[PDB]
Nucleic acid binder design. Structure first.
Ligand SMILES: [Mg+2]
Lengths: 1316, 66, 552
RNA sequence: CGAUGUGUGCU
DNA sequence: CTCTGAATCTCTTCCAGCACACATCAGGACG
DNA sequence: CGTCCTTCGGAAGAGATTCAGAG
């Protein structure tokens, strides 16, 4: 089965690996982020209510007051989306927050409150979205870019290489707080650890171990184990485990029980270790001076005097041995410090430490945080608790604690956001072990070390900024809390809230502006993740590796979609089938594989669990149950591409197209060409400009349908119905009864989008495509939007192409251009320039609006009305005065230079309290009657539906159809009929009728007010009237056009038909390209496009032959069946038998110009299939058919491949790129020409060409350039005199800017002067 | 080296066009510096001719007039 | 200055002065009313901070903002930076009498001249035509002449033709690496908005016709026009300044037509028949009665300037192709025939032009290379040598040597099972055997694409070199390479790893057929690596050449 | 009658 | 010892050119 | 409205500090 709409024009499918998954909904990201953001939801995570539970309740300073949270609510926005876009407001809804105050009594911690009070208090507005997800700020639709950042949490790196040239790596443990200060570790080449907070100085963490109140013995107990010597009978034998003997050389003759095992000088093998462990002897006799090299683990004070014989962090000597021996301390504790196994770092790190107690640690910390203050006890304590123990000042989220536990191989996934000592100590233990030689550092470029934030997350962050500001203000004003008279708005201040949200959506790099020239460009402007923004790095301090792709991106990040130049590999976007973890990672589907059967499911996987498994590729020849024909197969282990066994794999690639993004998805023949030109062609397809007349491509990919659906450019039928009424502006659909509401009748009434202005000054417009009286489908498009061709997305166009040289008109990127195309007008663009005209109240009174325009030409006056505004419909030239705004003594609105157009629309916005003149009131009444007629016809056709439901009730229950229609529609209810749910349904619809009365009255009056009400403007201005122009631009030789292959080009010259080569039929080619562009710029797939489109067009020509020269359904039936079967393994699966034979007429009219052909990305066609179509066509093998010259009329030797190419046009129109300035206005600070084109600016003359002039001897030239033509007013006035005299003589005088800089240094404390 | 000769330069104005102009200004201020400018870029900046080609013959003439 | 409204376009300098005068007035009032010394001490410290921030904030470790969380700009920062005074103002100058658009070719033009838009000519030369019309009396004043040329009347174009009769023009490109990026030319008035350019200047401009822009410059005084027509005239600009290279070398298309031209096959029309003059060969070939690429016996005549510039006439009879004689009529007098007596490659025609300038001087060399370019585009358009989908001819030995290297890496893996090879041993063995296999397939496709033509001679058969289109396009040396067609026809290389070592699996597929996901993924990685290298290479080269012009 | 950012695009 | 360089430390500074478009400018707070 | 107010580099590199090493 297929859609009845798809029965109009089916696509010839190609694809050999069958699918298990369709295309999911693409705009889920923004919807889910914003919906988890705002919802009346429990449990905090995630969204607004998490921030509310964090910030609330707000209590007093134990001053018997507490403001508690209740709820929040938002009503509708005051306006629509559309007139709001016309208006220049956000589409935002009133944040109405339910809050209750409780205030206690004197000695009432738990006692009775004196007053409670609760209100749903207002606090600002936040923007609601389009159902396409986006926001509009002030008539301008901007898009929030989600930001790639790292993971918050601990990380272990080395930072090797260029550190001190010692051949020595470093090691750094790096903790990233989700909210808090930086805290990282650092060693020496001399092997001692230090710590910093927020890139500050190099001081150890053993001082903060002192600050955590740990003794030296406790620290050595933490980070080390013990080695026990004892004062004994003779020579003080050692307790020994032979694992401690591993990897050593015997200092003396290793002996036990008087038996010799290892000689002195021998290295200890594991042989003798296991032999002595068979023997199991700890106590072994040691020499007295060998222990002098050991360092004691603990302190030893004397027994009699209680005085320190020897402290810890201290090596030994025999005099100390006698001093403790004459006291007789029978325990001696040392550390196992095997210098390859356990480096002695911590003991000597303590040897560095000058501080002793917790308090000197506190003083040193309090000094090093803020230098320039005297030390203070409680201030140091509060500072230390505010470092990483304060919930106010430090936290990591659930993701942060989870990845923290992931770093520690724990079990509990959750915890707090502040630190414990155990956290820091275990991180240090891991760091010591990485210093020792166990464990592995990890790159940042692993995607699990990265994380994309959401719109709701960063919105919650800004919301939290507003919350902490307003709670500081409230706890300020609750200290100012005036009893019995304060209400829950008397301390409110939504101006930080509003200022924060407006600064965020107004001034953010991530909030940037939508690209409206392409539905695909809009959706990839949505589907865009950056490496910049707040918390983002800097491009000028980023290496290659952070820009260059990592194999974790496979199946998750498209490798061939990024901008170039200043930001490469940093604005990388999402793939097709990739999705989003709850924890900000990239879950991704995989076809589960059993022992021999692919499980038909998918399953979502993390980055790190991809290393656990081994994933089968999509082009693996299974046999109908997962029976793969080999047992060894190319897979990856941990992104480790090599051939792997069949019983090893448990997972499989879902799609052959899931590896790329949606921009690459429409690009055929990728498997033959290079990604440079592929990425460039994807960029230029993003750079595409809309045409006038839509037409489908011939090489489809199947992705076009779901992209055109998910892009909001059209009307998807939200219900399945029957077409009732069609107009060019709205289409009425009568809803079928199955999806119909039980009460409140309704029919689908959708309004189109007509000729209107894009964000990029082009023609966004919607076009109907269906017939009246027609079955439709729920979830289906209804009318073509901009650059959409009959339920499909069709950007460019396709034309008659071939490859040969012709007189250098395909020289590098030159484009041979037939006259036939500019006859056919199929690349005319329509542009809309909008201007306004403000009415500011200024000095000497304001400036007026009417046509009192003195001392001007009467032709520009006669175009105006009485009110001073040219009429709608007026084709205008350049420089034409538009609205007369005379100055009190003229600054009238005028047409800019070089532009023409036609007056199409007037919009007026006048300040409230200002009288509108006759044109404004007249067009106001015009639009009033317009919307009045709109609402009236809505009420009347809903009335038609209502009494049609009443008629459908009276089909049964005493039907009197002749006694129905005689009396009018009203009392059709109470005719002869039972007292059932028929008549009760009629009563429901009568209540609906009275509701339509009251509702229509109140909506009509509200619309009267909204049109009537004055417009909020800036202070100073009185009215602003917007102007709309109709600009048409066909083509001119010199603009920039291309195709889908990185094949940039410029139209050189429009050329007649009599220059075009033509076949033996005489049909002239349209555009001819370079042969030499093919081998060097390695994009061979355009030749495949040429052959395939040539064959498809020959098929469509035979179709149009059998169509025009008429022929029955049977022969065309045979031909179309042989066409849609077509050779190899297909999933078309259609038959000609199941057709109404008149849709076949409609689909033949759809095929008379060409054939829709689907093309997979890496399951593309083969050359034998191409030759099959050529034999199915009337077309030869190579396709290099001879042609004949339009000039000489001879056969071209070595004939050329001809065909079609679905070409592309760009928004590089040279009228907005040609700019010249003989003499214009001058800058103020230096009397110099400016730049730009709006400002009529001059060309900047840089210094590279000054050096080029220095390679010449251009003495007069350089002198007249930089002095006369830039800086000196005297030189340019005298040169002006010379030119109006014909004279050629100059005097430079002095560069003014030279004097400017000299007086600037004179403004500095510098005696710089000029001598004689 | 190529940054050494740019700093070690009589043309302090060319050094001002080069990096660490502040150090150039401090060194010239403690120098009490006065410069017959010897070159190209500073003479572009002051807006006289360059002693390069035709301008070099003019500067031959200019030295000949003094 | 005000903005649009009562607010003003601010200067942070004025805020600095405001803060300093505020602090000073408060300090002097504290001096007036006998305040203690710690208070006025901190007051003086704040004043010292304010004055030093007016001097150089940012030299201090903390710089303050006024708003927008963006630190303000001090006087030293008014001086320095790449938006500094010499940077932004004193050298880089926005200058009148100039005009920027996108350029094009217009191949019929000449090197001394250039195409130029008529409306830009109307724009850029207003006071000239003002002075000329009031010189002819047809203009009353500045106002009348200005309104008449704003009307764009019929007579102003004639006076424009008078004033742009011989006035030179110059054009700039923004990556101005070396001096030949700007040259002097003669304007040709063009209906349109683009700028037509002679093809032999483009490589010196290093500019593709993708849509790159150039701007123009107006030589105002007469002496500047003298300078440009003397020094920066493109006719004077014939060689590299870096060495003795001819910088007017033809890039791709005319040399393609000529490499097509002076080839011959063994067997075609009039093979080895006799003529006496290339006029006759031209009359045969325009009739098509003879072949283009065939041996032809002609009588030829050359000249020899071995006296004191006096050219000795002599003649002979050669057997040669057709287009060599056709160009030999275009060939001026004092030349040998041995210079044009071969397949006439890219460097061959380059050194031909070199010797032509070294011997026959400047101007006949110039106009002769011009006529070369004209007839080269002529016969290139007449030929119609396309490219085909079957130009990439693939030997059957491809998959055989694939199977060979497959068996070899299988055996080295079997040795790696028991450990007969280690990691590095298997690594080196595998990279060498894939390199050798790829080189063998390269030799296979090399011979397959270079000597495939085996045709009759009027006899049975005879081999000769291949008439493949892409092989001849590479064999011209214009575009492409043997390694690049090796990437096309054969398999491509052995791609490296992200570190700098290599990946064990090469790209064994070709560009002619489809890849997997994986080989495409790896070569994509290498391509992105190369593109980032190009961008940061430009970033390095900028500051490089900055110091290079800063040193001597 | 602007100066800063902010992204965009061509080399 | 006491200076002798050397090594090693800790703070500078800079980094291609062109065009477009858009936003924001002192605003906060109290008379 | 009007007015008054205050946390991602790689280079040298240029000293600055320490050390070793002694005499
Ligand atoms: Mg270019």
């Amino acid at each position: 089965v297929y859609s009845y709409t798809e029965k109009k024009r089916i696509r010839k499918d190609f694809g050999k690996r069958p699918q298990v998954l369709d295309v999911p909904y693409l705009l889920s990201i923004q919807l889910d982020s914003f919906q988890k953001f705002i919802e009346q939801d429990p449990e905090g995570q995630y969204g607004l209510e998490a921030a509310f539970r964090s910030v609330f309740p707000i209590q007093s300073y134990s001053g018997n007051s507490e403001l508690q949270y209740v709820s929040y609510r938002l009503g509708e926005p005051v306006f629509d989306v559309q007139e709001c876009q016309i208006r220049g407001v956000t589409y935002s809804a009133p944040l109405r927050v339910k809050l209750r105050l409780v205030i206690y009594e004197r000695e009432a911690p738990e006692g009775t409150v004196k007053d409670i009070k609760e209100q749903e208090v207002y606090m600002g507005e936040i923007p609601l979205m389009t159902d396409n997800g986006t926001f509009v700020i002030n008539g301008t639709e901007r898009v929030i870019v989600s930001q790639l950042h790292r993971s918050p949490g601990v990380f272990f790196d080395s930072d090797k290489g260029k550190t001190h040239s010692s051949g020595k790596v470093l090691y750094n443990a790096r903790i990233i707080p989700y909210r808090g200060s930086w805290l990282d570790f650092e060693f020496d080449p001399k092997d001692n650890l230090f710590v910093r907070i927020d890139r500050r100085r190099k001081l150890p963490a053993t001082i903060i171990l002192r600050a955590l109140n740990y003794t030296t013995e406790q620290i050595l107990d933490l980070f080390f184990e013990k080695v026990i010597f004892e004062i004994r009978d003779n020579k003080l034998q050692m307790e020994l485990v032979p694992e401690r003997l591993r990897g050593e050389t015997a200092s003396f003759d290793i002996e036990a029980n008087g038996k010799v095992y290892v000689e002195k000088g021998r290295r200890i093998t594991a042989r003798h270790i296991r032999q002595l462990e068979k023997d199991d002897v700890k106590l072994i006799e040691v020499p007295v001076e060998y222990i002098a090299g050991k360092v004691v683990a603990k302190d030893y004070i004397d027994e009699s005097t209680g005085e320190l014989i020897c402290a810890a962090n201290m090596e030994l000597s025999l005099d100390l041995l006698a001093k403790l021996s004459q006291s007789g301390h029978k325990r001696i504790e040392t550390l196992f410090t095997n210098d390859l196994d356990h480096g002695p770092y911590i003991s000597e790190t303590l040897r560095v430490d000058p501080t002793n107690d917790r308090l000197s640690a506190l003083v040193e910390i309090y000094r090093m945080m803020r230098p320039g203050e005297p030390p203070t006890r409680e201030a140091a304590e509060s500072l230390f608790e505010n470092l990483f123990f304060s919930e106010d000042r430090y936290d990591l989220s659930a993701v942060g604690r989870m990845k923290f536990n992931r770093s520690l191989l724990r079990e509990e996934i959750e915890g707090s956001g502040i630190l414990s000592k155990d956290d820091i100590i275990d991180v240090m233990k891991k760091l010591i072990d990485i210093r020792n030689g166990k464990g592995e550092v990890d790159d940042i470029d692993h995607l699990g070390n990265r994380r994309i934030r959401s719109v709701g997350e960063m919105a919650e962050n800004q919301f939290r900024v507003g919350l902490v500001r307003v709670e500081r203000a409230v706890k300020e004003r609750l200290s100012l809390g005036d009893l019995d008279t304060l209400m829950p708005q008397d301390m409110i201040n939504a101006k930080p809230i509003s200022a924060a949200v407006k600064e965020f959506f107004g001034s953010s790099q991530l909030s940037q502006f939508m690209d409206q020239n392409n539905p695909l460009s809009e959706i990839t402007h949505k589907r865009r993740i950056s490496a910049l923004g707040p918390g983002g790095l800097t491009r000028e301090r980023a290496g290659f590796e952070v820009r260059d792709v990592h194999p974790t991106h496979y199946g998750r990040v498209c490798p061939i979609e990024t901008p170039e130049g200043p930001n490469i590999g940093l604005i990388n976007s999402l793939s097709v089938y990739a999705q989003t973890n709850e924890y900000g990672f990239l879950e991704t589907p995989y076809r589960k594989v059993t022992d021999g059967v692919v499980t038909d499911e998918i399953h979502y996987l993390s980055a790190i669990e991809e290393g656990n498994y081994v994933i089968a590729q999509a082009n693996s020849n299974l046999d109908e149950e997962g029976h793969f024909v080999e047992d060894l197969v190319t897979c990856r282990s941990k992104g480790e591409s090599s051939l792997f066994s069949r019983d090893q794999v448990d997972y499989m690639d879902v799609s052959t197209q899931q590896v790329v993004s949606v921009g690459a998805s429409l690009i055929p023949f990728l498997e033959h060409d290079d990604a440079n030109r592929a990425l460039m062609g994807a960029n230029m397809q993003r750079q595409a400009v809309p045409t006038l007349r839509a037409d489908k491509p011939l090489v489809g990919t199947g992705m076009e349908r779901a992209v055109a659906v998910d892009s909001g450019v059209t009307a998807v039928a939200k219900r399945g119905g029957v077409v009732q009424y069609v107009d060019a502006s709205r289409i009425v659909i009568k809803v079928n009864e199955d999806e119909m509401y039980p009460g409140e009748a309704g029919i689908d009434i959708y309004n189109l989008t007509k000729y209107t202005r894009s964000n990029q000054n082009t023609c966004i417009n919607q076009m109907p495509c269906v017939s009246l009286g027609e079955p439709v489908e729920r979830g289906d498009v209804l009318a073509d939007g901009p650059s959409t061709d009959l339920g499909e997305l069709a950007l460019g166009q396709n034309m008659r192409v071939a490859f040969m040289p012709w007189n250098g008109y395909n020289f590098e990127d030159s484009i041979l251009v037939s006259e036939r195309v500019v006859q056919e007008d199929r690349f005319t663009t329509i542009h809309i320039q909008e201007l306004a005209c403000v009415s500011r109240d200024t000095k000497l009174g304001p400036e007026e609006i009417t046509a009192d325009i003195p001392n001007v030409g009467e032709a520009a006056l006669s175009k105006l009305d009485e009110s001073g505004i040219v009429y709608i419909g007026a084709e205008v030239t350049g420089g034409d005065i538009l609205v007369g705004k005379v100055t009190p003594k003229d600054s009238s609105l005028r047409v800019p230079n070089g532009v023409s157009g036609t007056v199409i629309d007037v919009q007026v916005f006048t300040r409230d309290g200002v009288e509108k003149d006759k044109r404004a009131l007249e067009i106001e009444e015009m639009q009033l009657k317009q919307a009045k007629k709109d609402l009236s016809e809505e009420l009347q056709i809903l009335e038609a539906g209502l009494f049609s439901r009443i008629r459908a009730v009276l089909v049964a229950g005493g039907v009197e159809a002749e006694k129905l229609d005689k009396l009018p529609r009203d009392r059709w209810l109470e005719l002869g009929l039972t007292d059932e749910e028929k008549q009760n349904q009629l009563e429901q619809l009568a209540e609906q009728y009275d509701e339509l009365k009251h509702e229509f009255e109140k909506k009509l009056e509200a619309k009267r007010r909204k049109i009537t009400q004055g417009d909020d403007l800036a202070p100073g201005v009185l009215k602003i009237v917007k102007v709309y122009l109709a600009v048409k631009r066909r083509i001119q030789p010199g603009d920039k056009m291309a195709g889908r292959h990185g094949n940039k080009g410029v139209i050189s010259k429009i050329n007649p038909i009599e220059d075009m080569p033509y076949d033996e039929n005489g049909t002239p080619v349209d555009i001819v390209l370079n042969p030499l562009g093919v081998p060097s710029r390695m994009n061979i797939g355009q030749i495949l496009e040429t052959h395939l489109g040539m064959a498809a067009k020959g098929i469509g020509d035979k179709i149009n032959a059998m169509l025009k020269q008429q022929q029955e359904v049977a022969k065309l039936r045979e031909f179309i069946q042989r066409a849609y079967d077509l050779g190899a393994d297909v999933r078309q699966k259609v038959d000609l038998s199941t057709f109404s034979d008149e849709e076949v007429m409609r689909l033949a009219e759809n095929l008379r110009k060409g054939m829709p052909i689907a093309t997979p990305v890496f399951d593309g066609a083969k050359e034998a299939e191409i030759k099959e179509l050529l034999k199915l066509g009337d077309l030869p093998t190579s396709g290099q058919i001879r042609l004949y010259d339009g000039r000489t009329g001879e056969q071209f030797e070595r004939p050329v491949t001809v065909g079609y190419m679905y070409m592309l046009k760009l928004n590089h129109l040279v009228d907005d790129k040609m700019h010249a300035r003989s003499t214009g206005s001058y800058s103020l600070v230096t009397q110099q020409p400016l730049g730009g084109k709006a400002q009529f600016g001059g060309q900047r003359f840089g210094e590279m060409e000054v050096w080029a002039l220095e390679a010449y001897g251009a003495a007069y030239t350089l002198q007249e350039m930089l002095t006369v033509k830039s800086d000196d007013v005297n030189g340019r006035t005298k040169m002006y005199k010379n030119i109006v005299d014909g004279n050629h003589q100059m005097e430079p005088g002095m560069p003014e800017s030279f004097n400017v800089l000299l007086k600037e240094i004179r403004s500095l404390g510098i005696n710089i002067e000029l001598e004689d | 080296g190529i940054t050494k000769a740019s700093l070690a330069t009589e043309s302090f104005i060319s050094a001002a066009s080069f990096q660490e102009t502040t150090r150039v200004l401090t060194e010239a201020a403690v120098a009490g510096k006065r410069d017959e400018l010897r070159g190209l870029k500073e003479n572009v900046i002051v807006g006289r001719l360059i002693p390069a080609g035709t301008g070099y013959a003019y500067h031959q003439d200019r030295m000949r007039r003094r | 200055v005000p903005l649009d409204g009562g607010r003003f376009a601010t200067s942070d300098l004025n805020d600095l002065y405001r803060r300093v005068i505020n602090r000073n007035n408060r300090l002097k009032r504290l001096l007036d009313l006998a305040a203690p010394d710690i208070i006025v001490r901190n007051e003086k410290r704040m004043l010292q901070e304010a004055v030093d921030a007016l001097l150089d904030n940012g030299r201090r470790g903390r710089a303050i903002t006024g708003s927008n969380k963006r630190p303000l700009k001090s006087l030293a920062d008014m001086i320095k930076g790449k938006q500094g005074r010499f940077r932004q103002n004193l050298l880089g100058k926005r200058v009148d009498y100039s005009g920027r658009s996108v350029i094009t070719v217009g191949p019929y033009l000449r090197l001394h001249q250039c195409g130029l838009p008529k409306k830009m000519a109307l724009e850029l030369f207003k006071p000239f035509i003002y002075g000329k019309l009031e010189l002819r009396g047809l203009a009353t004043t500045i106002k009348a002449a200005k309104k008449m040329v704003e009307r764009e009347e019929a007579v102003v174009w004639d006076i424009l033709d008078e004033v742009i009769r011989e006035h030179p023009v110059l054009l700039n490109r923004a990556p101005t690496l070396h001096r030949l990026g700007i040259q002097a030319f003669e304007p040709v008035l063009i209906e349109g908005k683009a700028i037509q350019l002679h093809p032999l200047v483009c490589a010196a401009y290093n500019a593709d016709f993708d849509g790159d822009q150039m701007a123009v410059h107006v030589p105002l005084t007469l002496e500047a026009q003298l300078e440009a027509r003397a020094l920066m005239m493109s006719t004077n600009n014939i060689l590299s300044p870096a060495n003795g290279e001819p910088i007017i070398v033809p890039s791709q298309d005319v040399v393609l037509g000529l490499y097509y031209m002076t080839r011959d096959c063994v067997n075609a029309k009039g093979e080895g028949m006799v003529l006496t003059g290339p006029k006759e060969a031209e009359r045969l070939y325009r009739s098509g009665l003879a072949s283009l690429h065939a041996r032809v016996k002609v009588r030829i005549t050359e000249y020899e300037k071995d006296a004191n510039g006096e050219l000795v006439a002599k003649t002979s009879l050669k057997d040669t192709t057709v287009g060599r004689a056709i160009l030999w009529m275009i060939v001026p007098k004092g030349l040998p025939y041995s210079i044009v007596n071969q397949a006439l490659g890219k460097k061959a025609i380059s050194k031909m032009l070199n010797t032509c300038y070294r011997i026959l001087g400047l101007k006949p060399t110039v106009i002769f290379a011009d006529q070369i370019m004209y007839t080269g585009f002529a016969y290139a358009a007449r030929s119609g040598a396309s490219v085909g989908i079957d130009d990439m001819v693939i030997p059957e030995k491809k998959h055989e040597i694939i199977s060979e290297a497959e068996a070899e890496v299988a055996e080295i893996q079997e040795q790696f099972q028991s450990g007969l090879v280690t990691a590095g041993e298997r690594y080196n063995k595998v990279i060498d055997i894939w390199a050798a296999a790829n080189d063998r397939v390269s030799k296979a496709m090399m011979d397959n694409l270079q000597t495939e033509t085996v045709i009759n001679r009027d006899g049975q058969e005879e081999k000769q070199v291949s008439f493949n289109s892409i092989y001849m396009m590479a064999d011209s040396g214009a575009r492409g390479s043997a390694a690049q067609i090796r990437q096309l026809a054969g398999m491509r290389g052995l791609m490296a790893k992200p570190d700098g070592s290599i990946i064990e699996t090469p790209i064994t597929a070709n560009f002619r057929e489809g890849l997997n996901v994986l080989q495409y993924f790896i070569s994509t990685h290498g391509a992105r690596k190369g593109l980032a290298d190009t961008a940061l290479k430009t970033a390095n080269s900028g500051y490089l050449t900055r110091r290079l012009v800063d040193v001597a």
